[PDB]
Design a protein around this ligand. Structure first.
Ligand SMILES: CC(C)=CCC/C(C)=C/COP(=O)(O)OP(=O)(O)O
Ligand SMILES: [Mg+2]
Ligand SMILES: [Mg+2]
Ligand SMILES: [Mg+2]
Ligand SMILES: [Mn+2]
Lengths: 320, 335
């Protein structure tokens, strides 16, 4: 992202906080409104805002050059901040259901994005498609979180649940819809692109990129140079665990049953040793090359009047 | 009414099918979501959902009250019940409560716990899918979506304000003012319980005049304040649900008025014993409420508030049926 794109995007955030904390309204509840400003300030605008900035970039690469006014690019930035409010609610729910934050802050922050949408977009033709997209993405993300939870019982991973079909569904519902589809579909709607066939062609490619993104992340959790990866300790339905179970003989499966999802550092090393024995690094290398080629082909084939350069830019960001 | 109750209850199974059986790649999680809805949504009194139907029936032109429109009002009532179910799932986890409507709290069910947070957000998100299915073609669609999102935001402000009356699980009695109490009740309870059903009835009746919505709101916030004060009173003075407001350190009307009326010695009993787990501390607080004459104070408030609200309803500007607001008063005051 350019300095100009980043600075213009960041310039919106203080307005969003003022909008949501009723600045100029003279509220009857100033204590809790001031607290909510801190919830937003402490949790929403920090670090990389990749999903929010991707919303702006998607809009800039989908819209007609003539319509790329400072006003329309600022609307794209506001949609980007609504994606970041959703991201912040999800990260808050993560901080809560593993560990100042109150349990209802995740609900509150999620609800706040709809107030921002009403303020800035309610008079535009894209309003209803955009709110329905956020509604649908919220519901599907919750389904993905529940499907992930159905892989654990009484603090132990259920290895019979670790199928590639279930893994692919968790990644799609829990992560890819809100991370990859939502920014691009928002850019399309702000560009007055409503055609279901266009959204569908974008979705096919974005779910493929999202699957590689999570598989790469799962690979690096164990095999990256260090955050220090805890997927094995936490019993996560990781791509590595799924493929290990596909590749295991009965003796190797017994090692997974005994040592996967255990707190002891030695058990994490036993699983890493089994992943090495099973050739998961070589399997990832083959998958990275094969998935790159398939996705590149699908982007070359993209039709329905969609630009290729947006999808190539997304693919190159993930694959480097 | 038997007919109203049965017609309303008949809609629930269709809504569960709409939300779980219309994602064919993930049947395990749709089957689980059906159980989340079946446990948390349809077993209560459904006062708020039924009140949405009654509000609509009293706001709509009699000649437009078709079975089809009454069913739409019922679907909106179930969306209110979905919102409430999400809120109580979350509140029960936050308050670590044992039971709700005489069932174990959802978060206490095997392998839920903090996953109740995801179930809360899921149940709330689900009502917008119901709205899209049945209302997307109607002029009331966007006002209704916006009302649900705004009431969710305001209810969260109420829940967070309630939490600013506690520090590390101990009540902050300096926070227990009638001003803060009134604000908690308005935002945490009255908006979703009283404003939302009536405003939904108004929108389905194509009544969009913000001033009609404002006048309804003034009366409904007054009725909602009495409703919560009565509930607080009965938590301590009701005849056996066994009330635990004292043990929980709740910012109750009884605690607020006790602090107004207390001499320094009585204040110290509140400081020492309010929000403690020991049964004898609850007894000490109840005994202080008796010493301070809170029963007589409630009896006077019940009489005066009834008369003041009846006066305000008589003054409601034409367009709104006084009968609707009197019917709500009669439900709450039982007269
Ligand atoms: C944003 C959220 C989660 C709002 C909760 C709304 C609500 C009605 C809580 C119950 O209040 P309470 O805990 O004072 O009373 P009860 O005794 O009914 O739990
Ligand atoms: Mg990871
Ligand atoms: Mg509670
Ligand atoms: Mg009560
Ligand atoms: Mn509570």
């Amino acid at each position: 992202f350019s300095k100009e794109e980043s600075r213009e995007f960041m310039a919106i955030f203080p307005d969003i906080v003022r909008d949501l904390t009723d600045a100029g309204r003279h509220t009857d509840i100033p204590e809790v409104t001031k607290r909510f400003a801190k919830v937003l300030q402490y949790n929403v605008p920090t670090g990389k805002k990749t999903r929010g900035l991707s919303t702006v970039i998607a809009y800039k690469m989908l819209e007609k050059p003539e319509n790329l006014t400072p006003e329309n690019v600022r609307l794209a930035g506001i949609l980007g901040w609504c994606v970041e409010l959703l991201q912040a609610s999800l990260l808050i729910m993560d901080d809560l259901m593993d560990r100042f934050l109150a349990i209802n802050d995740c609900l509150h922050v999620e609800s706040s994005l709809y107030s921002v949408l009403r303020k800035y977009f309610s008079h535009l033709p894209c309003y209803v498609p955009i709110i329905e997209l956020f509604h649908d993405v919220n519901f599907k993300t919750n389904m993905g979180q529940s499907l992930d939870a159905l892989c654990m019982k009484d603090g132990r991973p259920i290895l019979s649940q670790f199928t590639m079909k279930r893994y692919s569904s968790i990644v799609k519902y829990k992560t890819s819809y809100y991370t990859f589809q939502l920014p691009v579909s928002l850019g399309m709607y702000l560009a007055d692109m409503y055609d279901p066939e266009q959204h569908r062609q974008a979705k096919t490619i974005l779910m493929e990129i999202g699957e590689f993104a999570q598989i790469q992340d799962d690979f690096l959790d164990a095999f990256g140079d260090s955050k220090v990866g805890t997927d094995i300790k936490e019993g996560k339905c990781s791509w590595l665990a799924v493929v290990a179970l596909q590749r295991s003989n009965p003796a190797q499966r017994q090692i997974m049953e005994e040592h996967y999802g255990r707190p002891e550092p030695e058990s994490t090393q036993i699983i890493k040793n089994l992943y090495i024995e099973l050739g998961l690094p070589a399997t990832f290398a083959v998958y990275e090359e094969e998935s790159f080629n398939i996705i590149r082909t699908h982007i070359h084939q993209i039709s329905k009047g969609l630009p290729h350069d947006l999808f190539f830019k997304i693919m190159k960001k993930i694959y480097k």
